Write an enzyme that holds these catalytic residues in place. Structure first.
Site, PDB file in Angstrom:
ATOM      1  N   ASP A  96       0.835  -1.188   0.000  1.00  0.00           N
ATOM      2  CA  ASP A  96       0.000   0.000   0.000  1.00  0.00           C
ATOM      3  C   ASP A  96       0.875   1.245   0.000  1.00  0.00           C
ATOM      4  OD1 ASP A  96      -2.471   1.412   0.159  1.00  0.00           O
ATOM      5  OD2 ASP A  96      -2.004   1.822   2.261  1.00  0.00           O
ATOM      6  N   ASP A  98      -0.304   4.983   0.906  1.00  0.00           N
ATOM      7  CA  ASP A  98      -0.571   5.952   1.972  1.00  0.00           C
ATOM      8  C   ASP A  98      -0.223   5.386   3.345  1.00  0.00           C
ATOM      9  OD1 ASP A  98      -1.826   8.093   0.369  1.00  0.00           O
ATOM     10  OD2 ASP A  98      -3.447   6.704   0.069  1.00  0.00           O
ATOM     11  N   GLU A 105      -1.148  10.648   4.129  1.00  0.00           N
ATOM     12  CA  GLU A 105      -2.358  10.245   3.411  1.00  0.00           C
ATOM     13  C   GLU A 105      -2.571  11.275   2.315  1.00  0.00           C
ATOM     14  OE1 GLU A 105      -4.454   7.709   3.925  1.00  0.00           O
ATOM     15  OE2 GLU A 105      -3.141   6.832   5.440  1.00  0.00           O
ATOM     16  N   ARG A 141     -14.924  11.960   0.876  1.00  0.00           N
ATOM     17  CA  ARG A 141     -13.762  12.832   1.021  1.00  0.00           C
ATOM     18  C   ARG A 141     -13.408  13.508  -0.297  1.00  0.00           C
ATOM     19  NH1 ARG A 141      -9.633   8.544   3.272  1.00  0.00           N
ATOM     20  NH2 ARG A 141     -11.103   7.159   2.191  1.00  0.00           N
ATOM     21  N   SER A 185      -2.784   1.042  -4.320  1.00  0.00           N
ATOM     22  CA  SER A 185      -3.268   2.072  -3.429  1.00  0.00           C
ATOM     23  C   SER A 185      -4.746   2.307  -3.662  1.00  0.00           C
ATOM     24  CB  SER A 185      -2.486   3.374  -3.642  1.00  0.00           C
ATOM     25  OG  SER A 185      -3.019   4.416  -2.859  1.00  0.00           O
ATOM     26  N   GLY A 186      -5.458   2.592  -2.575  1.00  0.00           N
ATOM     27  CA  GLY A 186      -6.764   3.202  -2.648  1.00  0.00           C
ATOM     28  C   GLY A 186      -6.708   4.668  -2.958  1.00  0.00           C
ATOM     29  N   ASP A 253      -1.282  -0.822   6.177  1.00  0.00           N
ATOM     30  CA  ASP A 253      -1.588  -0.331   7.508  1.00  0.00           C
ATOM     31  C   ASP A 253      -3.079  -0.247   7.810  1.00  0.00           C
ATOM     32  OD1 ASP A 253      -1.749   1.949   5.630  1.00  0.00           O
ATOM     33  OD2 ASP A 253      -2.075   3.129   7.453  1.00  0.00           O
TER      34      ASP A 253
HETATM   35 MG   LIG Z   1      -2.607   2.922   3.837  1.00  0.00          MG
END
Ligand SMILES: [Mg+2]
Ligand SMILES: [Cl-]
Ligand SMILES: [Cl-]
Length: 305
Positions: A96, A98, A105, A141, A185-186, A253
């Site tokens: 990941d 972020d 982030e 967001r 990644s998101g 995370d």
């Molecule tokens: Mg993350």
């Protein structure tokens, strides 16, 4: 060439103790103490003051060794992982971005440019802990970014994004040893493309912010990539390189990383909050990203410096 020895090698466990190189508290005496605490066959230093391998006597459950070692080290900033020695070195990394490969982030940093860092960061925190589903949290967001000029991305990237310690060494060292590495990644492709190339990843895959040509629309490209998209990307990478997810190490995370963490042969919750770390079989709370090299049995001599 003994088959008796050979089967023993498969059920053979090893514990690894790991400190942060910036707080390198794994003193030689501490390593010996820990190894005595589990009646170790031996003790092998991967990096002085930072990481050591402790082969466990055959017949000791991994859960026993983990409790014994954590007891001996209680109050020291030293991580503990236990695993089978065979196949601990992986040939796929999926990570990941972020708060894992980078310190920030990306969504919260963009929110600052809309004067909404705290509002958005509170949502991000609940999404990372699993209290809200990723996709509706992402939509909520990103909607608050509507109207920001596209110039804001490079501004954020250049001035506020920093690489997590140990990241380039992790990626470059596994690549030196033939591994395939992917940043998933998101977050957003505008960030992962640059970050992936600074660190040295083979590829990246992330969500995409929509724009009208000059400003962000406040929406994300359909469909949104979340927890299952990370699982599917690990499956895709493994099939494409002719391996399986057992041959991968995954790290993140957040709650939405738990799919790929649990599917991977080695899944690491890195500096995760308790609810996320509770759901991973391996946790690194003190080390930096070099911890993932030590997990795999690399010695500091093997590193790309
Ligand atoms: Mg993350
Ligand atoms: Cl290479
Ligand atoms: Cl983007």
């Amino acid at each position: 060439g003994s088959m008796l020895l050979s089967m023993s090698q498969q059920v053979s466990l090893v514990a690894t103790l790991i400190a942060n190189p910036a707080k390198a508290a794994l003193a030689p005496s501490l390593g010996i103490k820990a190894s005595a605490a589990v009646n170790a066959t031996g003790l092998y230093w991967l990096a002085d003051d930072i990481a050591c391998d402790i082969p466990l006597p055959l017949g000791m459950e991994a859960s026993e060794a983990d409790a014994s070692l954590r007891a001996t080290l209680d109050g020291a900033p030293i991580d503990v992982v236990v695993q089978e020695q065979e196949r601990r070195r992986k040939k796929i990394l999926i990570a990941d971005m972020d708060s894992t490969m980078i310190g920030q982030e990306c969504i919260d940093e963009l929110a600052e440019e809309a004067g909404l860092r705290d509002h958005v960061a509170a949502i991000t925190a609940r999404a990372m802990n699993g209290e809200i589903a990723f996709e509706p949290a992402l939509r909520e967001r990103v909607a608050l970014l509507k109207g920001l000029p596209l110039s804001v991305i490079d501004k954020v990237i250049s001035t506020r994004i920093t690489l997590t310690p140990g990241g380039p060494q992790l990626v470059r060292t596994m690549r030196k040893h033939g591994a395939y590495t992917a940043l998933v990644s998101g977050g957003f492709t505008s960030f992962t493309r640059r970050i992936a190339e600074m660190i040295g990843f083979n590829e990246e895959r992330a969500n995409r912010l929509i724009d009208d040509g000059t400003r962000l629309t406040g929406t994300v490209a359909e469909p949104i990539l979340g927890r299952e998209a990370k699982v599917e990307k690990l499956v895709e990478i493994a099939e494409r390189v002719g391996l399986t997810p057992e041959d991968a190490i995954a790290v993140g995370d957040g709650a939405n990383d738990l799919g790929m963490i649990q599917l991977a042969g080695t899944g690491v919750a890195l500096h995760a909050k308790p609810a996320v770390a509770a759901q991973a079989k391996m946790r690194i709370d003190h080390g930096d990203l070099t911890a993932l090299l030590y997990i795999q049995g690399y010695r500091k001599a093997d590193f790309v410096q």
